[PDB]
Design a protein around this ligand. Sequence first.
Ligand SMILES: Cc1cc2nc3c(=O)[nH]c(=O)nc-3n(C[C@H](O)[C@H](O)[C@H](O)COP(=O)(O)OP(=O)(O)OC[C@H]3O[C@@H](n4cnc5c(N)ncnc54)[C@H](O)[C@@H]3O)c2cc1C
Ligand SMILES: Cc1cc2nc3c(=O)[nH]c(=O)nc-3n(C[C@H](O)[C@H](O)[C@H](O)COP(=O)(O)OP(=O)(O)OC[C@H]3O[C@@H](n4cnc5c(N)ncnc54)[C@H](O)[C@@H]3O)c2cc1C
Ligand code: SF4
Ligand code: SF4
Ligand code: SF4
Ligand code: SF4
Ligand code: SF4
Ligand code: SF4
Ligand code: SF4
Ligand code: SF4
Ligand code: SF4
Ligand code: SF4
Ligand code: SF4
Ligand code: SF4
Ligand code: SF4
Ligand code: FES
Lengths: 286, 184, 92, 380, 129, 427, 242, 82
Amino acid sequence: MEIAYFLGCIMNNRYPGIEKATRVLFDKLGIELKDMEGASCCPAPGVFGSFDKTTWAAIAARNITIAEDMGADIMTECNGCFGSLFETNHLLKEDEEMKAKINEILKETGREYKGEVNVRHFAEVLYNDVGLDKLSELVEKPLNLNVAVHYGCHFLKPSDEINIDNPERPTILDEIVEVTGAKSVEYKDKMMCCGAGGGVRSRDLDVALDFTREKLTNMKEAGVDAIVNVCPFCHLQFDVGQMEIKDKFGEEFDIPVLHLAQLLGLAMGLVVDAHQVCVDECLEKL
Amino acid sequence: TLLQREENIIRKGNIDKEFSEKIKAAGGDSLEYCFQCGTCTGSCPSGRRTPYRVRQIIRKANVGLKDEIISDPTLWMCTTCYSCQERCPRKVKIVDVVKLARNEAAKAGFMAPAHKAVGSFVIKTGHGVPINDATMELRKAVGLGELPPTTHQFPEALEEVQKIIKATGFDQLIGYNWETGELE
Amino acid sequence: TLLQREENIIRKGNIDKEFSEKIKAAGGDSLEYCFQCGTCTGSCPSGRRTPYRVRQIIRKANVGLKDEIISDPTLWMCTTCYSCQERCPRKV
Amino acid sequence: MKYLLARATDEEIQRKGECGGAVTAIFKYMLDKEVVDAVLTLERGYDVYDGIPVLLEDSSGIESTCGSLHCAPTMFGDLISRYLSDMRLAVAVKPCDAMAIRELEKRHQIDPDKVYKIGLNCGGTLAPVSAREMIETFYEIDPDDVVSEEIDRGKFIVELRDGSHREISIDYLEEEGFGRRENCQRCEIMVPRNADLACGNWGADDGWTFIEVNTERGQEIIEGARSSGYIEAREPSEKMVKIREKIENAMISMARKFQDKYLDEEYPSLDEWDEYWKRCINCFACRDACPVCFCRECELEKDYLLESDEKAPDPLTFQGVRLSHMGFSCINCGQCEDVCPMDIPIARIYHRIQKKYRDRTGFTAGVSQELPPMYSGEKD
Amino acid sequence: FEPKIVGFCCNWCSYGGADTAGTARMQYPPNVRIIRVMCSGRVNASMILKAFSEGADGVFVGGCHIGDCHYDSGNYKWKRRARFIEDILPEFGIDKERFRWEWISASEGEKFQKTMQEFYETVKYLGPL
Amino acid sequence: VDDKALVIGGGVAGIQAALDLADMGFKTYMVEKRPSISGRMGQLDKTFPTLDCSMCILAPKMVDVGKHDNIELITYAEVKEVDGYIGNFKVKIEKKPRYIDEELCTGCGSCVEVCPIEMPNYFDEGIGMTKAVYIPFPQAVPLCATIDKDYCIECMLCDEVCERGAVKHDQEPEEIEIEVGTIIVATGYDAYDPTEKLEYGYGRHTNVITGLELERMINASGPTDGKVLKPSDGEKPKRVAFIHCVGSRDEQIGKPYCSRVCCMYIMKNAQLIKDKMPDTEVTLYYMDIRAFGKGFEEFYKRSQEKYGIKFIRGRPAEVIENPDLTLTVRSEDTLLGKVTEYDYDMVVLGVGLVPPEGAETLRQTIGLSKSADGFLMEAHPKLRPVDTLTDGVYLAGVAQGPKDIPDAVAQASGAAARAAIPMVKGE
Amino acid sequence: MYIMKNAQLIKDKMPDTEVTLYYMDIRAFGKGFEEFYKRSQEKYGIKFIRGRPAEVIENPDLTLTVRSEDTLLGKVTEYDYDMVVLGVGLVPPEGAETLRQTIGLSKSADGFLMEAHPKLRPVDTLTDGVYLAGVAQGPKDIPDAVAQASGAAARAAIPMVKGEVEIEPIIAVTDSDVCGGCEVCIELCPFGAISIEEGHANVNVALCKGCGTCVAACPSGAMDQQHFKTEQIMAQIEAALN
Amino acid sequence: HEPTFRRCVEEAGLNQFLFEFANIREHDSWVHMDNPEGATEKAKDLVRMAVAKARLLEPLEASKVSVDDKALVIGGGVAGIQ
Ligand SMILES: Cc1cc2nc3c(=O)[nH]c(=O)nc-3n(C[C@H](O)[C@H](O)[C@H](O)COP(=O)(O)OP(=O)(O)OC[C@H]3O[C@@H](n4cnc5c(N)ncnc54)[C@H](O)[C@@H]3O)c2cc1C
Ligand SMILES: Cc1cc2nc3c(=O)[nH]c(=O)nc-3n(C[C@H](O)[C@H](O)[C@H](O)COP(=O)(O)OP(=O)(O)OC[C@H]3O[C@@H](n4cnc5c(N)ncnc54)[C@H](O)[C@@H]3O)c2cc1C
Ligand code: SF4
Ligand code: SF4
Ligand code: SF4
Ligand code: SF4
Ligand code: SF4
Ligand code: SF4
Ligand code: SF4
Ligand code: SF4
Ligand code: SF4
Ligand code: SF4
Ligand code: SF4
Ligand code: SF4
Ligand code: SF4
Ligand code: FES
């Protein structure tokens, strides 16, 4: 099938390995990814939603109109971008006054929002449109890895609108991980935030790094080889905040951070040089 | 001296009914029926390590204490993780109220220079996290293009983003200077 | 930074049950049955102009937060006017 | 299987079928395998403008019922409720037929267990005599030469005896007082999702029928018809399933525009309605044709309501009473206006009243499976 | 111009309200004629349309207050029918001000008197139908 | 065992008990000290949690009691002596002089029209006036006039205006002796008098009222024609405060119990005020919100959501009267942890329930034991809630302790069953 | 109340055990309940924390940390406990719906059985001859349930004492020749007096109260009310106007 | 006074439901004291309505339903036991 592909900022501007692994995986699955030419920031919900709702909604709607013109659903492999675009989409679908205001704003750009497309998440597409049996077929390398799955806040919440899985005790990402042969390890406060969302990372790096330090402490207590996430924002937090924690508190955690696409690429046959935490030991442990 | 005759008593001088009505009309009406159980504060990961108390934020929004809220720094300790909203027994849209209060604080002028920097980055390039040279080399090496199919590549997309920004008044909100391209 | 790992959470490390037992044995037995209505704080003329909060002092004495009490300067803002004690519905 | 592309395996059926003959193949399977006892369909008479209902008990010579007849604005619900009530049956239904059958089923006049609904996409029908006059006036041909008819890119198009095709923009015809029936222009429903199957050509290629399966019963029909090889199926491209959605949305938007025209802007004034009501001859053809008016004895014929003299009835005690009785369940099928010997636009007022009721209460006549809120036993 | 007004009043409250108004000697215009039913749930659109077609300039229906019905739900059905009748009536040239439906309790003599006075004034201002 | 019953009290519980006993085929006496039956339920405007009219549903029951063939109603009377035991009770009742003949009087009210003296009406709870000759309320049963001789000046104008000759200024108290098998005490309660709470200023501040007075003012048949007006100037209040647990849960006054209904009727009256005047601001000062009954929690949420009523958790410390007669409530908002001094045009005290006047006299007369809170004690708190340790005597309604109307009615029906069992057995 | 009772019983059995209650409101409304509440603190030293706990976390040693805000101290607390007891509420029993359909009763919003009138008929139902006692009607304690049971006994005995019930003949009647069996009238009877037999509506004489709602709802006029027939009301309308 | 006149007619031997009542005191005479002509015309109209209803009345008999003196209690808890 076909699906519009939204990149965001971090994945295409800081971690191209995620993009490369996703592209390779999705042609291996007979799904065509169509680029959304001219796409911009989702925009990042934390700052723009906090400063002005109209600007955030207008930019997100302009991004959605690209996929609408392409006549395909948007697919996102970022919790932040998925949250922003999903919220904008159904907010504009479920009311007309906000849609009218956003369309009046977009008129100057020559675009019109129609609400004829759906926003979908990488992991949800893999679970539903592909299936666990279809992905088990493409594992050439059973992996030997104790993995700490980080769901992220905006993958499943607010669950009243998303309806993908249970926010408290989800299983979807654990099943997708265990498809590859890696073992998902339960650790304390698994569903806790990484600390990057909501703009906190840009306003108080100490608080965000405290969030990250707490989960890294729990993760290390659980004895996990790597962290697997579905958000470039969470990826960047877990990757750069580890070095920041080392620089500030001298607290050493060396747990490589992997996107779900990269983990699926390790089984099945990564631009790890972009990662601030070396992944070489983890690969050698395989 | 511990004497402070103004910060230790609430009278009608500390209350603005217009502010609460405006918050309620903007999409946060559910705050009207919070019964102050404290589940949100117990669920908050920012309340365990900062003076941020979401329950008291909801209470102050309902009472009309506008100045006590918009000027409050702890308002910016919420990561919008939605745990409180997922656990509220009255189904209050806590995060919506938090974001509306943040919007009012920003218009009142309580914005952080780093958030202004991110906004200026979006105005300049259309990306909140613009690309740097090292990642350009990495993209070139791996097999992707030097610039992604985004506003980094298409100037017309950047012009569309900038007119949206001008239309919504975001530049005046963050005090952007188009003439010099600087945060004035 | 607003980060403070210790002042924003109460654990067993902050509690001295011996201090509570000592207070109750010396004649503060009544604090055991305060139901936190807040009449004492509303009556307090010091609480209107200082961060002194008599109800929270009674709460902390019941809980056993010795360091939170003895080191607090606001403990010395009470004039012993007895208004709170006159109006307390539990007769604390 | 929500969507399929099906076509008959019999060469005769696919040849004679409008859209690959899937519907005829389903009927032939259902009769042959005894799923149902009969099939209620249309069959052209002595020309394409003469479509008569037929009840087939066996599939022998079923291909005579193939093809679409756009000049047959028939209602089947009334026939199924008056005479065919205790039969297991399969019926071809336009969305208005399905709406009438649903309103009759929630009133226990038709048993939903016994009736199978293979609904058809409907973009509108035409009155036969009006259609012939239109073809004479605008296509400049003898109507007897027309062998087939369809509406599409905004175009009524006619196949001819010679073999060519003649095309005219339906916007022009409908602006000249011709084309689809006025109630069909206001029709808000195009796919019969209140039927078991929904067959059309809006997402199909040539020689195939695009089928949407609405119910598990539709799934059983399709499975039984494919397993025995009566129908061959494939799956639409999802590029097709989207072209269909866009077409349907455009059609519904145009229907809403026509509702705003006929029911608000061109709605007759009170004086014009007085002029119309002066004409009524109290024949009760509107009541008889209405599928929702099924009662064994009608209140309008009681001594305290019926007009005794040979003069026009008081519009209140006739029309307002029928409105209070059923106007929340009006399906805008236009039968009452079709049969009126005096050419009164009854359906306009009845549809306007139903629209007011729907806007206030949100009840959709012929779509919702429940009774109107009027008959609610709760204290809402 | 003296308008002709036909009234329907439930036995338990609205008939009792008119009786209470009479006992207190509260004066209202003589134009209304009251028909007694057990419940306002007995009234349907046929009655209102008949009254208007037989020459009534205004039609009044009086029931129990919502929650007070002597049969526990009749006034709910009547309220549904009354809203639908308000939809229907203007389609035939009858101003919906000519159709007045109210909840009157058995002790609200003053409410009945005021309702009758205002309804009479309104119908008189509207003029013959 | 005698097959006759006595029911002391003419409230909803007593009415229910009498009707249940009479429908079971037992001749029942009903003794009511007020001139008419109804109790406190007849004084309420609406009821919680449905906000449905109170008198509209009670009045049919009162008429049924007054028309029943198995019920002898004796209003304006008191039980003076009780002797004997179960099945053999000897009861001396004293009917007070009405100075009106209950048989001749039709309740037309002309005497009230002509009377030149004005006195407070007991039904209006100190905020309404009537004449020396009065009918407590239009739905009174019996619909008879009463003369208060403490105010009558003997002008004899009622004599002149009466056409039935029902006025009897020479009437004397009457002694009635009855024999019954069982007694059901249904004497209800009185509202707490908050005058002793000097800090809240009731009786001194003009614009401080109790919940019962607010119930009378809200009522469309009340002294204000259903208009809530400031006593100071007779204008509507723009800001109203409600104080919970006034006279309850307080050891400074020896009232350590919960009155069980004040939360719900406070919220009900706030909702009614908001209904009548949507622009009025209403604030409730509470410790706990006890919305425990069926639909009560939804009623609480609806008060917050639909009506926008403000809830402040904190027992007010003081009420102060400003020179302009507005009221400053000084109270700690415990959930904000800060003192607040909010100004209001009216303050309503959520007074509790106490045993009625003369409760001790009747309790000694019958010979019953009272509970710690001052109400009557049942035989066993769990399994015999309507019985007493005195055989043949049963309790119903708030006589056994504070409760709402459904609970009182259920207790009245249960007491009727328990009283019927001995009279059915006959030994 | 049962949380406080069990806390007091634990303290009686184990004087040295520490007991804490996490509450939103303390609903000690019944007779002697407020004194019970106070005695929980004065006599047994039970601790009360006002706050709805956010989470309960199991430690490796199986101790339980209750993460909850103390809203009166205004601060988050994480206290460890050897045991956590949940104050579970009351729900209708298993098979409640089956019995409710068997008898034909109606349930209230909270899922329990509905009484005829919330105020004056707490134990009766709109289904004549059926009464509710105890928690079947809604949550309550033992004395309330006992009072309701005795009241239900009285209300049930009244009809059985009488031995007969008289029904006024202003009831509704169906003409089976005109009834189409549409059944739109069935749910309009609040007393459930209408049923469907042999494809026609039948009004139970004993259950009809004579309101006339079903009569006004029937389109064809197959239902008519005795003493208030449609013909009679139409005649009255005509006479009033002509 | 409907029960009074129903009893009167039934003692006369006429079915009590063949009796109709017209309200000309509370509805006509006590509320239109200022308009004697209007009051008389309204009384005539009300009597006409009453006669119109009476012309179509039918005799009805109350029905008696026997009640069995056995009870069923579902549930054997404290409430059911009580
Ligand atoms: C009036 C009309 C309008 C239509 N409009 C649209 C449209 O706008 N868009 C769209 O996608 N499809 C429309 N259709 C359906 C279209 O013809 C499909 O191609 C076809 O229904 C798919 O099934 P088939 O060709 O396999 O059926 P066939 O094998 O041709 O069998 C069709 C069956 O429908 C029966 N039938 C039931 N009602 C009628 C009637 N009123 N006139 C004629 N036959 C009838 C026929 O007698 C026959 O048995 C319309 C059909 C009709 C009758
Ligand atoms: C302000 C307020 C509002 C309320 N609102 C509601 C509400 O909305 N809904 C609700 O359900 N409940 C409400 N209640 C509670 C409700 O009023 C009671 O539950 C109910 O009135 C109790 O009825 P009762 O018959 O037990 O007592 P009462 O109503 O007090 O009746 C007792 C009767 O006994 C008479 N009597 C007293 N002593 C004697 C004696 N010695 N001899 C003879 N007769 C005597 C009294 O005069 C009276 O007639 C409210 C209470 C208050 C105070
Ligand atoms: S959880 Fe909901 S109801 Fe409770 S304090 Fe937080 S916002 Fe209020
Ligand atoms: S969304 Fe904000 S307030 Fe709510 S739990 Fe997360 S950080 Fe706390
Ligand atoms: S007044 Fe008494 S019970 Fe209330 S908070 Fe103060 S000490 Fe506690
Ligand atoms: S004695 Fe006076 S100053 Fe001290 S706490 Fe009590 S009221 Fe406050
Ligand atoms: S009314 Fe609708 S369904 Fe019926 S023929 Fe016309 S367009 Fe088709
Ligand atoms: S009223 Fe006319 S348009 Fe409506 S359902 Fe009946 S026949 Fe069809
Ligand atoms: S007009 Fe009324 S009674 Fe007559 S058939 Fe239609 S719905 Fe039935
Ligand atoms: S079909 Fe036309 S003429 Fe005949 S009764 Fe109906 S409206 Fe009158
Ligand atoms: S005493 Fe006479 S005047 Fe007074 S109310 Fe009774 S009957 Fe009327
Ligand atoms: S005699 Fe007494 S009651 Fe009668 S009018 Fe004179 S003062 Fe009033
Ligand atoms: S019911 Fe409420 S207001 Fe009344 S005493 Fe109890 S807690 Fe206080
Ligand atoms: S009585 Fe009337 S409404 Fe009821 S089922 Fe028969 S026809 Fe239908
Ligand atoms: S008349 Fe009323 S009570 Fe009788 S069957 Fe019909 S709806 Fe039920
Ligand atoms: S009894 Fe008057 S409305 Fe039902």
